Subunit: 144 residues, 12 copies
């Protein structure tokens, strides 16, 4: 609910999503393999970058970012994926739903940070929103 | 004990160590801050790369790499760090001990893979050993 | 009046302005030729980029960008230039007035998008405003 | 029929085709999205470059290139596309037919320019023919 | 109090701070020399860049930036440093306090510009705030 | 059976495979064209590089590499492909089987070279094995 | 005699010549070794590129390029070299004679393609002629 | 009149023109100085490149290029400029007339080489014609 | 009169001149705007670099460079410019006179440093003289 | 005898030597062709650069550089070479003697400029001397 | 005999060989000068790199690398060359014999390190063997 | 005392100092390790470059540079360091004293070369003096 709390929960989602997409990356099979293998590598590296960005946002608010993977699992709103076989369509469907979750949270981040006069977090949140809106649009087109 | 099992436990250590050093990176304080902040970023990105490399080694053996962060926590031999205040000397002492752990495991990896005639894993293991030996030497010199 | 409508009319202006400045580029004569020839190429490529950017903004709002050149001509607020002989001073005077038009529209874009809570379009609009303010200042100095 | 007239009509086709493929680019849906989205961006930028090249050819013959988008619509032999929903196969079928049209025109350009002793336009036309022949071959293979 | 006045006083601070840190750069002594010598060069070049950025912001508001160094000294809120011997710790303490001053002013810049509907200055101010927040955090960690 | 003999037969396979995949590259048709056309170009250039590498290995053992294409055809274990129409799936199936053949041979190369104390050929063979294992894994995933 | 037939026979010559010069490259001995070793690597890579270029020319005429090395040996006008010992002077003498052969064929290619109105093959042929004329001139100077 | 004779006279013109424009470059005065100083450096380096290109064309025809500056002065159709004071307008007027001379000669080069079946010189001549046509157009626009 | 004193007064001139030309840069108006705006940015950055170079020369002589802007104003021989409106011709006239001043001082620097056997300052001074002589020549040509 | 006179005569030598070595470049024959062809291209481009450098030195002294090739022939101390057949050894012998001539002149340049207090020409002359001494040493070693 | 002892003696050879080839580099005379001068610079820089690599291998074994040049002379198996005149053929003969010495030692290094389970030194040794085998082959071809 | 003798003794110092700092590089321990390890690598590579530069200066005077490491030890004025344990402060103290020695010698080099009219060695010596003065200043600041 507070800005740093939204950030910390997003940092948890970021690494959990990194792991989820890492799973997809190595376990994707079928005629779409080559495209999905490449796309998922880009997607999980973006989540790795987001993890780093969010940590930076947290310290500048005078708080500690995630300390452990145990803490990431605690705070995450993302369900971890235990399956190792999917079809490529289901991979993109899953990632889309996760992006939609993130968009909702970054919207809340922006609004909450604005109310506190936290101009830097607002900028960061709005920039992430632009990236997410593009990713969502492309996955929606792919799945249409 | 089997090659793929050593690899999977190392993949678990890799991401746990990534997280541990990420913690150090953001929480380091004192006159050594600037050097340790930079060094730890390089160190955690190396563990992130190792995580990826090990996943690749696992699939080529016909097995699944780590599926979840929960699975990483299960398999890891590394204790997760919950503290958020250290002195820079203790950070390097900790990382050194972790490197020493990894060196022992990559030695075992190389030996085990050789016994199975797994030439590619041997090459990978021996290459990692070279990197670890350099990191260990430098931390030992720093702490001498 | 709605955000997507402002965007679509701006996309129309963008390509019409691209064409207008393309005309200037090839038809400029006189001792200022070399500077104006180069400047106008940069200016029309900026309008080409704007055309692309605006299309991206439109799809993310769930609408279709411009479909045809006929549609661009319909929606544009910019008068198309049929002359093929100008003096370089009149070229810069014309472009300045077009920039001023665009600035007014991007101001309206920013305000309208803000009212709808469209954070991404606001960022885009404000970024374009910065570019336009620089272009306007330089043309005003040139013509002073 | 004269060289400059062929060039001017081709310049009209170039920007109309730029717009047509820009439409395809943003409106493509389905499992082929990512490949077609990328390919169409390359294709429309090629038509944008062709537009520029043709303008250069026109001025060197002592004539004015296209002045307005209205003039492009007047001179074009290409039907503008008002639809906003296609399947990816139909996009490539359409572009192929347009390439075939262009090849016929650039053939005529080369022959006409040769008859007038316009060596530079011949070179330009023959170079464009090489590009078109490659594009056509690849689309034909894709659709076979 | 007005946006252009805040900008002009900040431009004065920027060059005065450039000079102050230039002084530190050349006069730093002791075992920290090499790190501080390098860091201060980066810091003073950032203030030189800020000086330029602020001048650009001023002209776009229709005002004149600083005309002379005499004018910079008049408008500055920063005390000029006449000492030529410091310890490296005091250098970082001083720079931190200056950054804190700048952060307060850029906050005021952002708020004031927002009230006037000056969207471009707001963006500029908020971007500078992000840079300052990072610099402050790192110096605070170093000094903790 | 001797190291240089394995190398020479592999050099023969390399150029024969280069040619086979060159055939696939130009003759592939269908909706997968663009991906297969690109992939096969990379694959045949890898076989061209392998051809060169193997020649280098042969001379360092004091023997002559392949002298003629006639000699390559003589020594090869690979059947030359006379067909000019395939479906993309069959192309990848074929290449996979060829990779599997190569992996078996490079395994034998490594083992044989080790027995002779030829350390350099062992390194070369094991490095090629790593490349082949990756290629095989990806084709197997694609075809699963 | 037909354009595609000239192209196919040239494609055969290209790979046969690649192989011939590859032979020279690895088997050259004597005080000229270092210069000839380097020059021959450049020469055989040029023949490899020519092989690719000619295949592209063939498909655009609606025909199949070379399918197998057996087919290259069938169609080639170049004698394969079975010797493994030469002097560097004889290497350059041989390559010169091969270049002269190619020049004659590319001349015929250009003339034949022109008669059929194949503008693209003419351009390609004339471009190759320029390269060959340079290579021939330099070898003639070397041997004078 | 023969191809090699046209080439040799053009090589003479090239270096004489290099010298003429070198003179302009260093002796230009007035408010246009900076633009003309830069433009003339580009122009004289182009003539230096042309000098080299023409020499290459001559040797491939089995003839000797220019041996001495005395020979260049003998063969040139260009009047050498002894003045050291001009106005920038007269510089561009002069260069334009020289370009026009060159265009006429390269036209004759192309036609003459075509009659002899010298395909490579034709290509070279036509390529130079394209460059000259652009230079002429721009100078004509500048002077209009 | 002493080497370090000449250097310190030149360092004062350098930053004062940086400021003077910064003023010109932002306040230039008229048809020459674009060229003068660009040229003045290069000129003021050169003075900024000179400021740095001179500081380095001072410390190597065992003295302190300028401590404050107040000290720069004290030591400078350059009049600060309070005007904000000039014509471009007067800008270049002013800068020329300043360059001439600097040339006289760097001449004195070189001579004085030579008398003291200060070889490094001589080299530095003579290198600056070369730069100044070029700048002066070009401005004199522009104004002729 | 005066500095500007030495410079002007050297500028004449520079272009005459450019031409002489250009002659060598295109007319060299024999087993050394490839090395001499390359070396002479580097050598003549160095003389072309020297020509430019010397012109710059002349204008900064308030004089006109060479106006025409006729003037270069007048002032040169270098004999123009009319032969078109040499052996590679004689080419290097000739160039060596020319370098030796230049070294003597640049020595005189340095001494004369020093006497006039022309610090910039001294620096230029001494820098050229370093280049010449290296070239001479290498040619002497080659010919030993 | 122990791994670290082999390494230390090789480090001694490395710098002694660096010096020997440095001698050759500067003292080579005759028509082969330019090729040998260049080749020897590459060769001595390789020995300089080897010197560094071996030092790194030594410290990782917990020992001190060479402390002094006196120690290098003590441990080396390479005879230092006091002559200053050779023919280029004798230079390559000498270097070949030194390479052969090194190959024998790196073979022993690899075998000895393997027996101790020193996987990293084995990798290093085998990699050096590959480089040496290439160098030896090329020198043998040159001298054949 | 003669120029070539000063150069030869400096070449001896250069490689001895290279070795001394190489020793420091690998044997440095303690909290300053990372900075000193890096700095010393840069320092010893500078001495390696100096070694090369001095050899070049010697041959251009018609003399032989150092032939052997034995000769370097003979001529050096630098004491070789046999210790393998130091503290980082003592490393910088030692290097400073060596730099001071070099500065004295390069001063003598410059003066001696000037007396002989050796302009090139003077330039070289004065350039080295500039580098040394910077290195000395920084080490003095570090140790203050």
């Amino acid at each position: 609910m507070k800005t740093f709390e939204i950030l910390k929960h997003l940092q948890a989602d970021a690494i959990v999503l990194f792991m989820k997409v890492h799973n997809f990356h190595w376990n994707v099979k079928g005629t779409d393999f080559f495209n999905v293998h490449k796309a998922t590598e880009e997607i999980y590296e973006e989540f790795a970058d987001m993890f780093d960005d969010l940590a930076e946002r947290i310290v500048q608010l005078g708080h500690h970012p995630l300390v452990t993977l145990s803490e990431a699992i605690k705070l995450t709103r993302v369900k971890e994926e235990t399956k190792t076989s999917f079809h490529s369509k289901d991979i993109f469907k899953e990632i889309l739903e996760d992006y939609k979750h993130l968009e909702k949270e970054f919207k809340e981040l922006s609004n909450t940070a604005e109310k506190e006069g936290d101009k830097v977090t607002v900028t960061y949140a709005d920039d992430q929103l632009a990236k997410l809106q593009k990713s969502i649009w492309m996955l929606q087109a792919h799945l249409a």
